[PDB]
Amino acid sequence: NKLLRMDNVSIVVESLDNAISFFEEIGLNLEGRANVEGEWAGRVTGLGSQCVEIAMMVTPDGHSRIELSRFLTPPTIADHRTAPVNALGYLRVMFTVEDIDEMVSRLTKHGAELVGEVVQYENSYRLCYIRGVEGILIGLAEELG
């Protein structure tokens, strides 16, 4: 077979509006919104009667996307947005930015919180884990040189 591409990583959130704003602070652009109320969706997910509203975010380079999703029906029945770092399953998406200090300062001003501290790996890069919108874990890195 052939793997054409990794289209996107989806994240289920409580507020699409708040999620969109947070990711726009990171640098992604809102690419579109859609009220998915079809019945085919339910057939894919195995939920059946399903209505979800999504907002697709895309990075400036056009290669990566984040699909923000809010369930209307059926309502959500669990939450792992603030699971610990040492937990099995999806952990975080990592973004490389030009200036990690300015990004940490701006995000934190808007409510985000560092999980560890900003760390330098040799002379190659700097990175950190931060909890952003709705406590969701996100990684940030800066390439040195």
Ligand X SMILES: N[C@@H](CCC(=O)N[C@@H](CS)C(=O)NCC(=O)O)C(=O)O
Q: Least separation, in Å, of the C-beta of 79 and Na ion?
A: 5
CA distances from 5 to 27, 31, 56, 63, 90 (A): 21, 18, 16, 9, 19
Beta bridge partners of 57: 30, 66
Report residue 72: phi and psi, to 5°: -100, -45
Q: Least separation, in Å, of the C-beta of 120 and a copy of itself?
A: 7
Q: Which of 21, 31, 33, 99 forms a contact with a copy of itself (CB under 8 A)?
A: 99
Beta bridge partners of 82: none
Q: Least separation, in Å, of the C-beta of 80 and Na ion?
A: 5
Q: What residues between 31 and 60 interact with ligand X by CB under 6 A?
A: 33-36, 53
- Per-residue x/- marks for a copy of itself, 8-27, CB under 8 A? xxxxxxx-----------xx
